[PDB]
Design a protein around this ligand. Structure first.
Ligand SMILES: C/C(=C\[C@H](C)CCCCC(=O)O)[C@@H]1O[C@@H]2C=C[C@@H]1OC(=O)\C=C/C=C\C=C\[C@H]1O[C@@H]3C[C@H]1O[C@@H](/C=C/C[C@H]1O[C@H](C[C@H](O)[C@H]1C)[C@@H](O)[C@@H](O)/C=C/CC/C=C/C2)[C@@H]3C
Ligand SMILES: [Zn+2]
Ligand SMILES: [Zn+2]
Lengths: 293, 1099, 178, 116, 95, 152
DNA sequence: GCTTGACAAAAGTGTTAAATTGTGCTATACT
């Protein structure tokens, strides 16, 4: 075992001296922001108090060194300076963690990367996106397999930049500023415009949790009255969707490639059999069973 | 029943409730009355109980009294706490954002032993929050509730766990005190490697006494021979270095180490609950320590009886931590008490140390006393504490259940994942104490539960249940409340057993409950106590589900949870087929107006109702009108009485939000059809008659509170004004002089409510922006526009405005000159997508709403209002919905049982003078005593008008419906009836979100989620998996680059869409750039390398 | 673990494979599941009827008709291509993998079968009562079994012996050896 | 004084209270680029370029140097007179005239919607 | 660029940390309690990390994009976009 | 494994896994299970060395180097968690689990990530090397036929 | 077409007073 580490340093040009720091890097201020909320009160990242303990103790150390000091005093400082950097990097990894008011432990540099709330799982392998929406779903029994009911309000916002250009292309609005206000206040002229932009422009429908890739499927949007979403009754199996009040998310593919992939790969009617057993999924169920039986 | 104004609701119960439902809010009140110890509580303990009642305040005051330092030269004694009259009224507090509190004063005695003087000074501790009549508190203007906690009572508990290594039995013991280090058998304060014998030498007992007291114990003698410790002071050293490693000991420290850790009262606190538990089971001293070891020895030997010098014989058996005998509830009064103790112990530190550095004889109770930590404890408890919660009021029921809720979470108990699943399992001792049926569906299952109906809390924190003791096969009228411990001692007869004349056991054998519990029989000779009535185990919400016995616990738990999720309607019609609790629970909720003195009505107005008592006294009641509730539901009340009416003490003067004529109405009665209909109601979806819209039967009101403040800015002062830097004179059309929306106006998303402006700093306008300023001559204004506007997707009418100004005195935090609150309300019609449900756990969204013209409709021409699918009914194991669907039709059209000859056989054991009821009469079927299947059928055939004399429903509960579209009858008979369905707080208007572009997070550039921020959806790990499974790279990349994190890319794509150009190529996700930076800050050198191109820079 | 697995090429050309039972002894009877084992596969070597008939050539999709045909000739086993034996340098090959359950045809070259496999295994896990998720995780994690059971170390007859509270099994080799 | 004594708060606190989120991620970025504005601002920049085309070579030349459209650096009446070789007053005059020309409804009608 | 071949890590030497750094932060000071502006030589110091406002030095002697990438001889702040405040790192020299 | 050999272990593991899912009435084609099993046997233990004893090295990576013109091992069975952590991509192992552990060993070994795996490309915003992201597909060039341009 | 002188507001500079900010210090004895 001890040879593994010793060997690692040989092949690499890394000097093992790197494991001791003569200098500590300080993160950019916008990543450790301090800002005032609405009302004027302030809030700031924990890193600043952690950086504050380190720079405090390091400076106090310089002070004691210059005067000259009994080792007991100077050694006590170095031990403190050692702990302060440890907390900055990984807080609580050794001994009790540095805490603020209410006895809650401060957030170290390591606490940014690790966990479901860290950068990877939170801001990296997933994230919130533009051109998306959600609502509760209602049955689509009159819909074609490739279609979905889309609340007109929802659709207007999703496509807002598109309809803004269409109604400026037409004389409806003279400039983009007027086009924006024309959509915001929902002048009745936009609706006939919205139906054009939405035409043959697909959208992705997701319901969490997403178990198999069938949990996301494209559909052709159809403007619907009401604030709910009309879902085709045959896709409930794939989505595991109950109408007990579940909700679903809508995403708008933008680039040509994205729309191509929507229509071709993820289109609702192209995915029928489950890609595990090969058995049919969209196959009728419940009422349709007893209805045919 | 036995309520003066109670409406007439006929019951099928075959029993007679021997005991009225106790006051449901007592648990919250008595606890607080004990804490403050008012005279209403004093009389309680004095009549039957202790002769020295101690209020919670005094109890914690006795602990501090007196204060003395190491020298004992000066002492400070506390006594006689006092409360003044409340500062302001609850209605005033909720208006002004203050807390409802009575100031507290104390007697502070300061005695100097050397000078022998006395300085007596009246001390002001602080404003002490007071509990309302409803059992709530007003904390900073919002109404809150303090939930009672479940904790393991301090005591000695043993457990036997088999070790796989030896595959043999092992016994471990634990003693958990009120405070101080805990010991386990030695294992003390997380220090293992201990010879339980060595500590008996730490006290100084000689080895001779070990062979004397141990006696028959084999390992008792064998371990002392194994231990190499020689001497009493040398064992205290072997115990010293492991407990205090790194500190060289001393004969003075080593000996007081053991005494100060436990025997000393300061660091080891004897618990009244702990002191009582073990004192019978066997503050601390030796007698308790040696008793535990002797108890453990006999438990591993297998003897069931243990006795030692000068002690009472008790059984040696393992204990159950989940048995309610060893598990107690911490009531609000106690949860408050503990937080006061914490405040005094922190002040005691400042009192003691202040004496030393303060000039002697120049110090007074006021100088030594500093109440900063004392009030901080109270203020810090009512806010931010897990047990102090925003009261949940959707409806009177939701609130009444919040109080009475008991939980195992929060400080002082197992928290979240730590708790094992064994605790969640319902114990046999939960009967009549904690309702098994009502709990959360999610990760909290079994950790949260509601107190049962007749359950009652003990002054020691153990729940008691009412029982009727039986002697010699005769059940007396004696009712005795028994704790879980004493219940297992006796045998519990079943609530429903055949009753004999003046009373006696008629049945040959009687149902019984054992200490197992175990269910067995006898001849009725050996029974001691019997149940007070059915539904002892049930809670208030659970007892409100008609036909509870028929529905599976799964769907029932869903049924209770969804009653508390209902919303008050405008009409608020009561249930047609109910249970007993409907009326009793509405009055105990506090949302109904009750009259406290017999008298007559002087006046009745929408504003207030006044009554002239027989006493000549005059009471009056101001009616809550359209008061926005905590969650937005409407609190409006309406008077149910007329001018000349007589009334009686405890009657109902006016209805609350969800109540009608005194009983809870959580929904409406609707005509139901169980046929599947054209695929529109499918997979739990529902369809409605458009009548429910036109007639506002499911309509409900919702109210929002918007708030904006004008503060002092370092660059100036914020000013609320009608002047906005750039706006049309039209956008201000609805604003008044001050700049606030005019009352009664309509507001649309993005509309201005309160115009506000804040100073600006050096502007440096763009050259293109300055040229237009000169051309059109609009002078660039000195102040930016920060103005309150209505949130996205929200609209309504302006109800009222509340303005707090600095000019006007009022009060505001430092820096805040003016604060205005605008209240908007809206009438929400029942809409497709809204969530409805019945009491049985059946839930579903509205899938479609059809014109009354084309609907399944009876031969009358009467369209059914709702159509429920047939498929989800049978599999979910809730058949109550069908029953109440039949009975719902019974009560609607009336009925007459045949008087021809005698009474039919189905009525043999059955209803008393229920043989006839008019049309629309209301029914009540108590949960386990309710109507029975036989009696249903007999009623199914019954009185048959509509107007003309034809029957509209057969004895199977079916009818022939005509399709309203084609106009032809449906081939088969369809079940129709009336079912009670509730509107639920999940609404489409609130749940529908859409985003194109919007705000972005500061550190990370991603869009910030939630509707408040106008944010976007989260495309997560699992979703990216599905995207990858499909093999779409461009769709995936697009979502994670130009749709969220790409600062230059998201602005280009927008530019591209507006110009109809091609969407550009994505950039580098800002989050990743942040990653390299956070890795560099760790002293990790992360270099992005080209193929042959070495290092790359991100800039 | 599987997310980097994707079809990189049409055919790796190896002759290796695995033997599917496909039926036993009847009548004297398709194997209980040939739908999840034999079907959707691709023949590694020609399926030879008794004597020389060769009822199905190597590289056949093995649909429902091919199984009935094969059964007629009385073949009680078949050697098939599998990703276990696939020799592809990177990823796997379409031929070894076999038909795409979603498409009904030979897998496309872009397909990422690792993720599709992971999801296909996990998604039903919600229906696994827990002989359950604990046993499955035990297998994929390769941990020593909960209650370990012995396997024969070599061929030969067995001598069983009972010491109460225990068992003794001795295998007398056919060598006969130790 | 009581405003000075206020102490800041942690962006890393969890106020979700079974919201899982932390305060810090609820903070908007007010200096973030707004796509619709920057696009419209680019469209405004084009519309001005056109309106100036109607003006004389020196009329527009003075307007551009006066507000610093090309350089982003405005210039004083005297400095513009130094390039065109006149007195600052003469430039003051040419200013007033081209502005009443811009105020002419033909050129102004199109830029009205850009007020803000 | 969006296309890079390799991404590599390694122990950061004190020299690397110093090369990254645009200056040493010598004080545990966030911002002034009155003006609420960044304190010099402390955390947030504009002299080291970067300007608060685009093309604006601390004192303001050079407020214009006319000269980018010049440092103000008084406050010592560089004139450039405030985006650099998010890209730049300091360092601390331990005793 | 040590008794019947690597190719037999896979047959076993697939049978066992397929039995649990068969008890609950779940139909999963064996190939899916096989894709996962394949990843457990992909490495072998190095008994003698360029290589160190006890280390788990990729099978293919072990064959070409060991030859070295003119070092023995045994097949290794390892669980999915342990197998995935051995992946050649350090930032893919980091985001998976035991981040601090992974980063400390990657910085000492001075590891270089070629960004071949698809998770790596997701983090940095590249096109995953699968589906439409593969070279042959994304490099497709499209032009109308000369015969079609004539028809205009 | 454009310039000249008178002129006042606006913008910089230099000079001073007021304020804000940093640091030293406090001797019964107290570990
Ligand atoms: C999880 C929890 C409280 C959650 C906030 C709510 C409980 C969720 C369970 C569920 O509703 O299914 C625990 O609460 C206490 C201590 C530890 C835990 O705190 C936790 O783990 C987390 C938070 C604990 C207290 C938070 C207080 C403040 O957070 C907000 C404002 C303050 O009070 C909160 C209001 C809670 C009232 C809830 O009441 C319920 C319905 C809604 O969930 C809420 C209206 C009603 O059904 C009511 O009957 C249920 C009360 C829960 C009884 C639990 C007591 C133990 C609101 C969320
Ligand atoms: Zn292959
Ligand atoms: Zn400067």
């Amino acid at each position: 075992k001890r040879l593994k580490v010793v060997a690692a340093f040989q092949q690499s040009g890394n000097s093992p001296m790197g494991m001791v720091l003569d200098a500590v890097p300080v993160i950019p201020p916008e990543l450790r922001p301090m800002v005032q909320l609405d009302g004027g009160r302030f809030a700031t990242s924990d890193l600043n108090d952690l950086y504050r303990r380190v720079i405090n103790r390091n400076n106090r150390l310089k002070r004691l060194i210059d005067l000259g000091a009994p080792e007991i005093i100077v050694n006590n400082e170095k031990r403190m300076l050692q702990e302060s950097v440890d907390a900055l990097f990984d807080n609580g990894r050794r001994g009790r963690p540095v805490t603020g008011p209410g006895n809650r432990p401060l957030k170290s540099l390591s606490d940014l990367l690790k966990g479901k709330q860290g950068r990877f799982r939170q801001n990296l392998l997933g994230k919130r996106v533009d051109y998306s929406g959600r609502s509760v779903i209602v049955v689509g029994p009159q819909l074609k397999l490739h279609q979905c009911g889309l609340p007109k309000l929802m659709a207007l916002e999703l496509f807002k930049p598109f309809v803004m250009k269409r109604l400026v292309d037409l004389n409806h609005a003279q400039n983009i500023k007027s086009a924006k206000r024309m959509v915001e206040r929902q002048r009745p002229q936009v609706w006939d415009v919205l139906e054009e932009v939405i035409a043959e422009h697909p959208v992705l429908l997701n319901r969490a949790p997403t178990l198999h890739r069938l949990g996301i499927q494209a559909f052709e949007p159809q403007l619907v009255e009401g604030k709910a979403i009309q879902l085709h009754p045959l896709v409930c199996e794939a989505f595991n969707a109950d109408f007990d009040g579940d909700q679903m998310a809508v995403h708008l593919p933008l680039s040509a490639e994205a729309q191509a992939e929507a229509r071709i790969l993820m289109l609702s009617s192209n995915n029928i059999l489950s890609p595990a057993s090969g058995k049919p999924l969209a196959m009728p169920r419940l009422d349709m069973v007893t209805g045919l039986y | 029943n036995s309520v003066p104004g109670a409406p007439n609701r006929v019951s099928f119960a075959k029993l007679r409730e021997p005991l009225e439902v106790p006051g449901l809010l007592d648990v919250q009140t008595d606890s607080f009355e004990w804490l403050v110890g008012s005279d209403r509580w004093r009389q309680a303990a004095i009549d039957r109980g202790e002769e020295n009642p101690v209020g919670g305040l005094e109890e914690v005051l006795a602990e501090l009294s007196p204060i003395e330092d190491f020298s004992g030269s000066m002492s400070l004694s506390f006594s006689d706490p006092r409360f003044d009259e409340v500062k302001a009224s609850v209605d005033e507090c909720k208006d002004k954002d203050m807390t409802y509190a009575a100031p507290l004063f104390v007697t502070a005695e300061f005695i100097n032993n050397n000078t022998g003087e006395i300085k007596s000074q009246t001390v002001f501790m602080g404003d002490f929050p007071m509990m309302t009549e409803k059992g709530t508190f007003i904390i900073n203007g919002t109404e809150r509730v303090v939930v009672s906690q479940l904790v393991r009572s301090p005591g000695v508990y043993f457990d036997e766990t088999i070790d796989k290594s030896t595959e043999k039995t092992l016994h471990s013991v634990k003693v958990i005190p009120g405070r101080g280090a805990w010991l386990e058998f030695v294992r003390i304060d997380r220090k293992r490697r201990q010879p339980v014998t060595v500590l008996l030498k730490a006290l100084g007992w000689t080895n001779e006494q070990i062979v004397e007291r141990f006696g028959f114990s084999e390992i008792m003698m064998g371990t002392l021979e194994k231990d190499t410790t020689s001497g009493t002071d040398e064992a205290l050293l072997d115990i010293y270095r492991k407990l205090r490693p790194g500190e060289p000991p001393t004969k003075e420290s080593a000996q007081t180490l053991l005494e100060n850790l436990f025997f000393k009262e300061k660091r080891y606190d004897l618990a009244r609950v702990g002191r009582y538990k073990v004192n019978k089971k066997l503050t601390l001293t030796e007698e308790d320590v040696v008793a535990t070891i002797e108890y453990l020895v006999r438990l591993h030997e297998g003897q069931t009886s243990m006795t030692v010098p000068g002690g009472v014989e008790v059984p040696v058996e393992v204990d159950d931590i989940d048995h309610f005998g060893n598990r107690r509830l911490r009531t609000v009064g106690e949860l408050i008490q503990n937080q006061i103790r914490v405040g005094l112990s922190r002040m005691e530190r400042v009192v003691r140390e202040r004496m030393t550095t303060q000039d002697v004889e120049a110090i007074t109770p006021q100088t030594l006393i500093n109440i900063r930590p004392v009030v901080a404890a109270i203020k810090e408890f009512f806010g931010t504490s897990q047990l102090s919660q925003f009261m949940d009021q959707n409806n009177p029921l939701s609130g009444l259940t919040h109080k009475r809720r008991l939980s195992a979470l929060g400080p002082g108990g197992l928290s979240r994942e730590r708790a094992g699943l064994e605790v969640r399992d319902v114990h046999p001792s939960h009967y009549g104490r904690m309702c098994p049926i009502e709990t959360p569906e999610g990760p909290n299952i079994g950790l949260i539960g509601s107190l049962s109906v007749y359950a009652r809390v003990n002054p020691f924190g153990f729940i008691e249940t009412p029982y009727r003791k039986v002697e010699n096969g005769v059940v007396t009228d004696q009712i005795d409340y028994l704790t879980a411990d004493e219940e297992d001692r006796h045998v519990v007869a079943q609530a429903n057993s055949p009753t004999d004349e003046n009373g006696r056991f008629t049945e040959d054998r009687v149902m019984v409950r054992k200490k197992g519990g175990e269910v067995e029989f006898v001849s009725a000779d050996q029974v001691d106590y019997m149940d007070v009535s059915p539904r002892q185990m049930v809670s208030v919400a659970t007892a409100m589900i008609p036909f509870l016995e028929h529905d599976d616990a799964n769907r029932a738990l869903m049924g209770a949870n969804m009653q508390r999720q209902a919303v008050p309607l405008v009409r608020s019609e009561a249930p047609l087929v109910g249970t007993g609790m409907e009326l009793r629970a509405a009055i105990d909720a506090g949302d109904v107006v009750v009259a406290d003195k017999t008298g007559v009505i002087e006046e009745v107005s929408a504003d207030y109702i006044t009554v002239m008592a027989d006493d000549g006294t005059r009471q009056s009641y101001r009616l809550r009108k359209f008061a926005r509730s905590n969650h937005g539901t409407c609190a409006n009340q309406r008077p149910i009485v007329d001018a000349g009416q007589r009334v009686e003490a405890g009657q109902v003067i006016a209805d609350g939000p969800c109540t009608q004529n005194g009983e809870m109405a959580l929904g409406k009665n609707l005509l139901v059809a169980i046929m599947p209909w054209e695929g529109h109601n499918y997979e739990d979806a529902i369809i409605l008659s458009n009548r429910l819209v036109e007639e506002d039967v499911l309509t409900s009101i919702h109210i929002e509170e918007h708030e904006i403040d004008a503060r002092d800015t370092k660059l100036g002062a914020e000013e609320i004004t009608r002047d906005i830097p750039n706006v049309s004179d039209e956008v201000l059309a609805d604003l008044d002089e001050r700049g606030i929306v005019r009352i009664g106006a309509e507001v649309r998303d993005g509309d201005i409510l309160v115009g506000k402006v804040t100073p600006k700093g050096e502007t440096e306008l763009t050259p293109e922006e300055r040229l237009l300023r000169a051309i059109f001559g609009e002078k660039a204004r000195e102040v930016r526009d920060t103005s309150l506007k209505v949130p996205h997707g929200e609209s309504g009418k302006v109800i009222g405005i509340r303005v707090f100004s600095r000019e006007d005195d009022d009060e505001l935090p430092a820096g805040v000159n003016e604060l205005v609150r605008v209240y908007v309300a809206q009438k929400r019609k029942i809409s497709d997508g809204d969530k409805l449900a019945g009491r049985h756990g059946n839930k579903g969204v509205i899938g479609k709403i059809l014109p009354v013209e084309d609907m399944p409709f009876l031969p009358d021409g009467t369209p059914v209002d709702i159509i429920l699918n047939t498929h989800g009914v049978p599999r979910r194991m809730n058949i109550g919905q069908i029953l109440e669907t039949h009975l719902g039709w019974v009560a609607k059209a009336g009925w007459n049982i045949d008087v021809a000859a005698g009474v039919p056989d189905w009525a043999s054991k059955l209803p008393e003078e229920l043989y006839s009821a008019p049309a629309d009469s209301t029914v009540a079927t108590p949960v386990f005593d309710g109507a029975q299947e036989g009696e249903l059928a007999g009623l199914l055939g019954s009185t048959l008008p509509n107007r003309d004399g034809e029957v509209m429903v057969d004895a199977d509960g079916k009818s022939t419906l005509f399709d309203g579209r084609s106009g032809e009858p449906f081939p088969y008979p369809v079940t129709v009836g009336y079912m009670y369905i509730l509107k639920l707080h999940h609404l489409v208007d609130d749940k529908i979100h859409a985003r194109s572009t919007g705000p972005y997070s500061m550190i990370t550039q991603q869009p910030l989620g939630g509707k408040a921020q106008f944010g976007g959806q989260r495309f997560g790990e699992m979703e990216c998996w599905a995207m990858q499974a499909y093999g779409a790279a461009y769709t995936l990349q697009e979502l994670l680059t130009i749709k969220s994190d790409d600062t230059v890319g998201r602005v280009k794509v927008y530019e591209a869409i507006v110009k109809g150009e091609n969407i550009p190529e994505p950039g580098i996700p800002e989050s990743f750039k942040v990653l390299l930076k956070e890795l560099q800050s760790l002293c990790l050198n992360v270099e992005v390398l080209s193929s042959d191109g070495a290092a790359i820079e991100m800039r | 673990v599987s997310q980097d697995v994707i079809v990189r090429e049409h055919d790796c050309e190896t002759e290796r494979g695995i033997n599917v039972t496909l039926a036993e002894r009847g009548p004297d009877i398709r194997d209980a599941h040939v739908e999840t084992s034999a079907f959707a596969r691709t023949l590694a070597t020609d399926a030879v009827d008794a004597n020389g008939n060769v009822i199905i050539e190597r590289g056949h999709d093995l649909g429902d008709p091919a199984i009935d045909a094969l059964l007629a000739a009385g073949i009680t086993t078949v050697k098939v291509r599998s990703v276990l034996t696939c020799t592809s340098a990177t990823g796997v090959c379409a031929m070894c993998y076999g038909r795409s359950m979603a498409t009904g045809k030979l897998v496309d070259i872009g397909e990422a079968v690792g993720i599709v496999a992971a999801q296909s295994i996990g998604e039903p896990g919600t229906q696994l009562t827990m002989g359950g998720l604990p046993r499955v995780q035990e297998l994929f994690e390769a941990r020593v079994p909960r209650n370990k059971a012995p396997i024969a170390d070599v061929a030969g007859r067995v001598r069983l012996e009972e010491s109460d509270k225990f068992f003794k099994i001795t295998i007398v080799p056919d060598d006969g050896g130790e | 004084i009581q405003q000075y004594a206020r102490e800041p708060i942690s962006l890393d606190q969890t106020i979700g209270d079974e919201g899982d989120s932390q305060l810090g991620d609820f903070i908007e970025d007010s200096e973030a680029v707004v796509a619709v504005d920057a696009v419209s601002f680019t469209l405004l920049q084009d519309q001005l370029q056109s309106v100036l085309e109607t003006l004389s070579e020196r009329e527009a030349g003075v307007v551009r140097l006066r507000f610093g459209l090309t350089d982003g650096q405005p210039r004083t009446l005297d400095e513009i007179g130094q390039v065109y070789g006149v007195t600052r007053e003469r430039i003051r005059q040419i200013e007033s005239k081209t502005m009443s020309k811009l105020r002419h409804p033909s050129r102004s009608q199109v830029l009205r919607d850009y007020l803000d | 660029v969006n296309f890079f071949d390799e991404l590599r890590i390694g122990l950061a030497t004190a020299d690397d940390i110093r090369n990254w750094s645009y200056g040493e932060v010598k004080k545990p000071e966030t911002i002034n309690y009155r003006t609420l502006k960044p304190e010099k030589d402390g955390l947030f110091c504009e002299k080291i990390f970067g300007p608060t406002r685009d093309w604006e030095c601390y004192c303001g002697k050079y407020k214009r994009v006319r000269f980018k990438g010049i440092i103000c001889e008084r406050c010592g702040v560089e004139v450039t976009r405030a985006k650099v405040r998010r890209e730049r790192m300091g360092h601390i020299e331990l005793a | 494994l040590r008794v019947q050999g690597p190719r037999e272990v896979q047959i076993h593991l697939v049978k066992e896994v397929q039995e649990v899912y068969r008890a609950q009435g779940v139909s999963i084609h064996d190939k899916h299970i096989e894709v996962i099993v394949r990843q457990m046997l992909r490495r072998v233990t190095i008994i003698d060395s360029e290589f160190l004893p006890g280390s788990l090295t990729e099978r293919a990576e072990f064959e070409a180097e060991n030859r070295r013109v003119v070092a023995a091992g045994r097949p290794v069975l390892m669980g999915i968690t342990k197998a995935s952590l051995a992946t050649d991509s350090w930032l893919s192992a980091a985001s998976f689990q035991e981040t601090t552990r992974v980063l400390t060993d990657a910085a000492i070994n001075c590891r270089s990530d070629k960004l071949n795996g698809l998770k790596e490309n997701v983090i940095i915003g590249k096109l995953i090397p699968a589906g439409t992201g593969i070279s042959r597909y994304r490099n497709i060039q499209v032009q109308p036929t000369e015969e079609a341009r004539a028809a205009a």
